[PDB]
C-alpha cells in the first residue's frame with residue numbers, strides 16, 4: 536500500500552533520471568537551457584499520488600543528474616525549481632472543482648507561473664552559472680514557455696493513454 | 704522519514720536501472736547471462752534499510768529493464784531471482800550476531816545459495832528461454848559464481864567508502 540506507492544514512485548524516478556540525459560538545447564536560445572521529458576513522469580507522479588509524490592520525482596531525478604552530469608552544479612537546481620513550481624501550481628488548480636477542464640487550465644497557469652518565478656530567480660541564478668544579461672532573460676523566457684507547453688502536451692497525451700486499462 | 708527512506712530507495716533504483724544496460728556476457732559462457740552491477744545498489748539498499756528495501760530495488764530495476772530491453776522476457780526474471788535470493792540470505796546472515804565478519808560470510812553463503820537455487824530454477828527456466836542442456840547448466844554455474852563474488856567485491860568496496868562521512 537504505502538509500499539505500492541513507493542514502488543511506482545521509484546519507477547517514475549528511474550525513467551525520469553534516464554530521460555535526464557536525453558536533453559537538447561533550444562535553437563537560437565542559450566544552451567545551458569537544455570529541455571527534457573524528465574518532467575513528464577514527475578507529472579504522472581503528481582496526478583496519481585500527491586504533489587509530494589510529484590516533488591519526490593522531480594527531486595530524485597535532479598540529484599542523480601547532479602552527481603553524474605556534474606560540471607553544471609546549478610542547472611540541476613533550476614530544473615528542479617521549474618519542475619516543482621509548475622507541477623505544484625498545476626496541481627493547485629486541478630485540485631479544486633472537477634477534472635479535465637481543470638487539468639488543462641492547471642497546465643496553462645502552471646507554465647505561466649513557472650515562467651514568471653523562473654525568470655525572477657534567474658535574475659539571481661544566472662549569475663552563479665557564471666561562477667560555475669536582460670537580453671539573456673529574454674532568451675530565458677521564450678525557453679520556459681516552450682517547456683511549459685511541450686511538457687504539457689506530452690503529459691497530456693500519455694495521461695490520456697492511461698484510460699486503456701485504467702478501465703477498458 | 705518514511706519519505707526519506709522512499710527518496711533514497713528511488714535513487715538506488717534509478718542507478719540500478721541505469722547499470723542495467725551496462726551488461727557484458729561472459730567469455731566462454733552463454734550470452735543470455737550478461738552480468739551487471741544493477742545488483743550492487745540493490746545491496747546498499749538492503750544493508751541500509753530492510754531486505755524489503757533491497758527487494759524493492761532489485762525488482763524495480765528489473766521491471767523497467769523488461770519493458771525496454773524486451774525481447775528477453777525471462778532474463779529480467781532470472782536477474783531478479785538471483786538478486787533476491789542472494790541479497791536475502793546475505794542479509795539473513797549479517798542480520799544475526801555482530802557485523803563485518805558476518806557481512807562477508809553472508810556474501811559467501813549468499814553467492815552459494817544464489818548459485819544453488821538458480822542452477823535449480825534454471826532446470827525449469829532455461830526451457831522457457833527457448834520459448835522466448837546439462838552442459839549448459841555447467842556454463843550456468845561458473846557464471847553465477849563470478850556474479851556472486853564480483854558483486855560482493857564491488858559492494859564491499861563501496862559499502863566501505865561509506866565510512867567517509869557516514870562519520871569522518
Ligand SMILES: Cc1cc2nc3c(=O)[nH]c(=O)nc-3n(C[C@H](O)[C@H](O)[C@H](O)CO)c2cc1C
Pocket residue numbers: 558566567568569570604607609610611612613614617618653654657660661664675679682
Ligand atoms: C543557468 C541555468 C539556467 C537554467 N534555467 C532553466 C530554466 O529557466 N527553466 C528550466 O526549465 N530549466 C532550466 N535549466 C535546466 C537545464 O535545462 C538543465 O538543468 C541541464 O542539465 C543544464 O545542462 C537551467 C540550467 C542552467 C545551468
Ligand SMILES: Cc1cc2nc3c(=O)[nH]c(=O)nc-3n(C[C@H](O)[C@H](O)[C@H](O)CO)c2cc1C
Pocket residue numbers: 734735736737738772775777778779780781782785786821822825828829832843847850
Ligand atoms: C535464460 C536466462 C537465464 C538467466 N540466468 C541467470 C542466472 O542464472 N543468474 C543471473 O544472475 N542472471 C541470469 N539471467 C539474467 C541476465 O544476466 C540478464 O537478465 C539479461 O537481461 C539477459 O539478456 C538469465 C537470463 C536469461 C534470459
